[PDB]
A = this chain, B = another copy of it.
């Protein structure tokens, strides 16, 4: 399915980089429009939709002979922007409509740790070390927070506490992941040799 769509996009002169940006813009607009209004199930559906959309830029890149280093950096940077918009959008609902200050704390931990978890991996690789793995990578992050948000606002059978359950589980697991990833850095070949 993605292959004929990708080819059709290449055919009209779109590039993987433009499609990356367009999908990210749409996801961000969706998260920042729907979550602050309390439309958490709709917001989660829109975010998941653009997760699916995100299969197209990689498919486009493979078809035309390969991805680029800029494309990889752009794609990963857009992932951070997207994650940020999800948590900021939810934060707005939680802070100003639910007025739930403990949940704001969990949400802010999730927001910062999402960025920090990804940063450890990139910064480690920039030094020739490893810094991947751990409990929470981007797929687990999105499954947890979007399922919490979606269930909390689910049609006909909503369970509002689901939003808090997801955010607190994610916050704890994300802090642990930071420590795990730093431990992976520390054990990498060459990580602790002094360089004058």
Contact = CB atoms under 8 A, between A and B. Distances in A.
B108 A73 contact: no
Contacts of A85: 112
B194 A66 contact: yes
A64 B194 contact: yes
Chain A at the B interface: SS class: helix
Contact of A115 (B84, B101, B127, B193): B84
A67 interface: yes
A116 interface: yes
A193 B124 CA distance: 24
Given A70-B191, A73-B124, A190-B69, A116 B80 contact: yes
Contacts of A65: 194, 196
Interface stretch (A88-96, A134-142, A146-154, A160-168): A88-96
A67 B119 contact: no
B119 A74 contact: no
A175 B13 CA distance: 28
A1 interface: no
| Copies of the protein in its oligomer | 2
Nearest to A192: B68
B182 A116 contact: no
A77 B120 contact: yes
A48 interface: no
A128 interface: yes
Given A91-B108, A122-B122, A123-B77, A185 B64 contact: no
Contacts of A126: 122-123, 125-126
Interface of A: 61-62, 64-70, 72-74, 76-77, 80-81, 84-85, 88, 91-92, 95-96, 101, 104, 108, 111-112, 115-116, 118-120, 122-129, 131, 178, 182, 185-186, 188, 190-196
**Shortest 4 CB-CB distances between A and B: which pairs?**
A66-B194, A125-B126, A115-B115, A84-B112
